[PDB]
């Protein structure tokens, strides 16, 4: 009895909303003066330590598929890539038909994945036509009609090509995302979380942990690891799904190399503009390749199958190589050092299962490429200048982007896929959700205000 309205300001209560997050970073590169394609372009100073607060007695929903910030990650990474490529040289004067022949080196009367070529150019603008020569990995090139000595760069037909300036680095840096004032970010700390439904152990932060913007396909690499045993995340509107994300509790090492020496050459294009064509290949010629501990691979796919049959309770599971489409999805792909790789993963995925460490070492063939589509756009493409000398690289596999075949009697089947870059960031942003605080609460109370 005897109750009246009262207003409380600052009441801790919230609702879900779309909101513009801040890009945040270590304040200059890895806290260093180096030039790097992410953190050298703005993205504000360091979070020294995220001030995580664990909420008592909160039950709250999360939905990693319908998430409001993955789109912003996708746009922001694209924006940094656009802003950083924009000043660099457009290779447009290079784009006309090349004469080409078999490429070679001393004690290598062929280099097989490759072609030697020569082309018309102008060394200074409105000066005389001039001839220069270089070799290209064959995948950068198309052959014009007939038996044909005539070839062209694969994208300069359809799109403008920009050379990425050799001053930059492709290296990822640990980016952070932060709330603007009056928004808040929630983590969901339950160590078994499948990416949808309620969480029962929840905490808030002004910013995410670090995320590394690694471009990759088929294999999630240099990412986080799951806290439980292996977690399998899918949508659950339908058995039909675009991607399944498998998140490992144990990293599998992969090592890779481009062992041939590269002779960089400089061909002028204009005032302060130089194109780093790929000159003579040096050393005892090999393919690019990668290596894996076969014990760890077998254990990993056994564990993955042993979890995956919990979603799919009928008898048989099977893995296979890619069905078809572009190199970008039909192979595993990544950017070790400063060149792009494409690996025929078929020997990793020939495996089968049913109801009821430096030995046997797996090694895989890789091709490499200089002309690259990004974000699956068209009309713009990137040329990678050659990295001089020879290259070694090591990274951690952390998860698989699977997709599932047609369902048939007693038999599921899966293969590597994904390739749409959003699924990489969704494979790590699955934790977070963003909310707006609505602080102006009202309630009944056993009081009234004096009139005097």
């Amino acid at each position, epitope marked *: 009895e005897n109750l009246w309205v009262t207003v409380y300001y600052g009441v801790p209560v919230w609702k879900e909303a779309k909101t513009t997050l801040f890009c945040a970073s270590d304040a200059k590169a890895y806290e260093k003066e180096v030039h790097n394609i992410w953190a050298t372009h703005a993205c504000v100073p360091t979070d020294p330590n995220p001030q995580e607060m664990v909420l008592k007695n909160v039950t709250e929903n999360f939905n990693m598929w*319908k998430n409001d910030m993955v789109d912003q990650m996708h746009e922001d990474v694209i924006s940094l890539w656009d802003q950083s490529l924009k000043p660099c040289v457009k290779l447009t004067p290079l784009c006309c038909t090349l004469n080409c022949t078999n490429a070679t080196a001393s004690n290598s009367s062929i280099i097989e994945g490759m072609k030697n070529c020569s082309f018309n150019i102008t060394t200074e603008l409105r000066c005389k036509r001039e001839k220069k020569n270089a070799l290209f990995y064959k995948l950068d090139i198309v052959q014009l009609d007939g038996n044909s000595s005539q070839y062209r760069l694969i994208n300069c037909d359809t799109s403008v090509i920009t050379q990425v300036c050799p001053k930059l680095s492709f290296d990822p840096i640990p980016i952070h995302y932060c709330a603007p004032a009056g928004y808040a970010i929630l983590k969901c700390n339950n160590k078994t979380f499948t990416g949808t439904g309620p969480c029962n152990n929840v905490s808030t932060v002004q910013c995410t942990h670090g995320i590394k913007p690694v471009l990759s396909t088929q294999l999630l690499l240099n990412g986080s690891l799951a806290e439980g045993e292996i977690i399998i995340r899918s949508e*659950n509107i339908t058995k*039909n799904v675009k991607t399944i994300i498998v998140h490992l509790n144990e990293s599998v090492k992969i090592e890779c190399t481009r062992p041939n020496n590269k002779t960089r050459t400089s061909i002028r294009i204009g005032p302060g503009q130089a194109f780093y064509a790929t000159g003579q290949v040096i050393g005892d010629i090999r393919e690019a390749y990668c290596n894996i501990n076969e014990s760890k691979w077998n254990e990993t796919l056994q564990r993955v199958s042993k979890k995956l049959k919990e979603y799919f309770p009928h008898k048989n599971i099977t893995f296979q190589p890619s069905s078809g489409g572009d190199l970008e999805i039909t192979t595993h792909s990544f950017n070790c050092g400063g060149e792009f790789f494409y690996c025929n993963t078929s020997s990793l995925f020939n495996r089968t299962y049913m109801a009821n460490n430096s030995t046997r070492t797996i090694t895989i063939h890789c091709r490499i490429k200089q002309i690259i589509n990004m974000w699956q756009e068209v009309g713009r493409a990137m040329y990678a200048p050659p990295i001089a000398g020879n290259i070694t690289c090591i990274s951690n596999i952390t998860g698989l982007l699977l997709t599932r075949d047609y369902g048939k009697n007693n038999t599921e089947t899966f293969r590597p896929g994904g390739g749409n870059m959003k699924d990489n960031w969704r494979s790590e942003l699955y934790k977070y959700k963003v909310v707006k605080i609505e602080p102006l609460g009202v309630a009944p109370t056993r009081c009234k205000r004096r009139v005097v």
Partner: antibody, heavy 122, light 105 residues
Framework: QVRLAQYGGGVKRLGATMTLSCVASGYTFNDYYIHWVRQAPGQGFELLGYIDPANGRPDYAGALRERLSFYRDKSMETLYMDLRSLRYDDTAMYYC???????????????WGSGSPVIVSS | EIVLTQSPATLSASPGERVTLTCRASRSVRNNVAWYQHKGGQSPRLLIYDASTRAAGVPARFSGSASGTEFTLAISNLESEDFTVYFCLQYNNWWTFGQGTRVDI
């Protein structure tokens, strides 16, 4: 606004190979999966498979995995379906169809192309 | 392969009547079902999806509902537009269509 035009329909010789084709317009070509579906006369509709236009990934019905192939000329917003080694029972209407989906799941169809008839007899 | 059965195969009706079409599945498909009108010799059109959501620009006379493994399409007023073929489609697992149903005089 949107369309799926089609071509390639007509009489085809017994045991031959054909490429049918479909041309999109009016929407963001990377965002929607395309499905190839057919109807033989006196039969209910049937799915051949689907293709993601963005990366060109195909997927096929288990009965036809040997005979079909899909590809796209992405700059032209244009898709092609090969069916190898035709038989009398492939005589049907063929459609390309647009499929809606969230980032997680493919769902219902929302737009059908003009349809191409095919008749298999020399 | 999830089967859809439509019933009846052909439905006898008169103009301005309310009319009901039925579809059943060999096992559960949740609500992940849709209905299409198929005008003679033409590209089909979407009516309803998720067994219940009428799509944009579709006539308000169409409606639908579900119970377990069974799905129902209704039309409030038959017309020369609608004395035609219709089919149910499911997208829960794999895609599969019913044999279609014709509505006639």
């Amino acid at each position: 606004q949107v369309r799926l035009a089609q071509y390639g329909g007509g009489v085809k010789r017994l045991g031959a190979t054909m490429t049918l084709s479909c041309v999109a317009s009016g929407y963001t070509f990377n965002d929607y999966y395309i499905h190839w579906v057919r109807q033989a006369p006196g039969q209910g509709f049937e799915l051949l498979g689907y293709i993601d236009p963005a990366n060109g990934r195909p997927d096929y019905a288990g009965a036809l995995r040997e005979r079909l192939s899909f590809y796209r000329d992405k700059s032209m917003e244009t898709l092609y379906m090969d069916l190898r080694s035709l038989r009398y029972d492939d005589t049907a209407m063929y459609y390309c169809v647009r499929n809606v989906g969230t980032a997680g799941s493919l769902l219902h169809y929302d737009h059908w192309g003009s349809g191409s008839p095919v008749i298999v007899s020399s | 392969e999830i089967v859809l059965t439509q019933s009846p195969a052909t439905l006898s009706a008169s103009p301005g009547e309310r009319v009901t079409l039925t579809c059943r599945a060999s096992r559960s498909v949740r609500n992940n079902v849709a209905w299409y009108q198929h005008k003679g010799g033409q590209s089909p059109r979407l009516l309803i999806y998720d067994a219940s959501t009428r799509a944009a620009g579709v006539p308000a006379r169409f409606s639908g509902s579900a119970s377990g493994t069974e799905f129902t399409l209704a039309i409030s007023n038959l017309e020369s537009e609608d004395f035609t073929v219709y089919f149910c489609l499911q997208y829960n697992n794999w895609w599969t269509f019913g044999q279609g149903t014709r509505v006639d005089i």
